[PDB]
Amino acid sequence: PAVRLALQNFDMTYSVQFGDLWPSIRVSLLSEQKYGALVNNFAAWDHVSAKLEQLSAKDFVNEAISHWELQPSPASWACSPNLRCFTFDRGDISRFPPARPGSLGVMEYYLMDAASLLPVLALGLQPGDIVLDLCAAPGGKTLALLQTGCCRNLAANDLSPSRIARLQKILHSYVPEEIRDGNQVRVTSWDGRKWGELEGDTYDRVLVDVPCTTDRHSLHEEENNIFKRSRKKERQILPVLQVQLLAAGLLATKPGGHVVYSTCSLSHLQNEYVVQGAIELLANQYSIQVQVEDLTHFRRVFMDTFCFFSSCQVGELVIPNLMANFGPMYFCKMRRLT
């Protein structure tokens, strides 16, 4: 029912947005998704990389970086480094086996939607950055932010204490105790919208991977479905929350710092309307100027692995396709100027 209401709502909205492209997306959302194996750098990545190559999988991040020169600055200056994520070839539907513990009793790799790595890559972490993951749970992107080896400090926040338990489970499974107990990582459970007041102008890089209508998940899971009749108000006020969280992320960013906003929804009301809405709110209410940064070179380099909806005005959007079934992933990089 909620699964059918989600699909009903997506047929109305996404048939208008994508037009003749909507069927290819619709079939992909209603079929098995493609995963990437994010290699754990704490677990001796060279052996894991070699083991994953035996399956005929290839690191899409390395393939992308190789062509960074083709068609300004090194890939490391623009794109977050040391992220190795293996995927099978275009059209291949092979599944990675479950990861096992390795080099330091830590899991060798993390299976995830390969597109979920793009907001982290696009954020462009540099060595020694103070980083904030405002809506971090269950920790997929938090894990990737750590893997870069650039975080001087990493703040991982999420309002839900139950989802934070899953984030702690991933940190215990993937990260050695030396790093996860020190001053390098800090897990909090608080309202992300309040970050403007507490910890303002503090972070170099901020990830705001907001709660959205989780389009693919909403079509599979019936429990805790946002499209349930009781959650009608919660779903309609979702773009308010998303602007509030993005604005809080921007207020916690140092002047000159960068922010990546992202969702796993195809809806423009949750994507471009939130970026424009948060930029206006900061310019009017706080007199802070925020510039959207162009990710066209980033897109063009990663087009070999993902299907992008190139008609995006602000930010970029990975649309699912059977050839590369990487779920809806919207992302926009910004720079706080004043």
């Binding site: 619709r26 079939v27 209603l30 079929s31």
Partner: protein, 112 residues
């Protein structure tokens, strides 16, 4: 051969309707008539096809005589319940000649 020619006539495969049947299913003159009776019985009382429809099914989809009674019942059910096709359009389209795999492949793709 005359005794089978008579069985097929009363079954409605007269008036040159057995042209298509002999091309695909020439075994029909060698088959056991209770195996042919089992197929018409499954279609008439279990799939609720009228006698005129069953005759057209045999004329246009002779393959159903070689089909398993279970596989053939599930194939019919897929059209009536899963796809929502009424008995006349199933017969008119010659749906029962195709494989359940081909049917599932094309129907579910379009559905999704």
């Amino acid at each position: 051969m005359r005794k089978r020619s008579s069985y097929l006539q009363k079954l409605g495969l007269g008036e040159g309707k057995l042209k298509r049947v002999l091309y695909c299913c020439p075994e029909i003159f060698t088959m056991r008539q209770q195996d042919i009776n089992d197929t018409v019985r499954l279609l008439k009382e279990k799939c609720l096809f009228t006698v005129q429809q069953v005759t057209k099914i045999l004329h246009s989809c002779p393959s159903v005589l070689r089909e398993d009674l279970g596989q053939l019942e599930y194939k019919f059910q897929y059209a009536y319940f899963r796809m929502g096709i009424k008995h006349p359009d199933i017969v008119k389209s010659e749906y029962l000649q195709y494989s359940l795999t081909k049917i599932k492949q094309r129907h579910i793709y379009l559905e999704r």
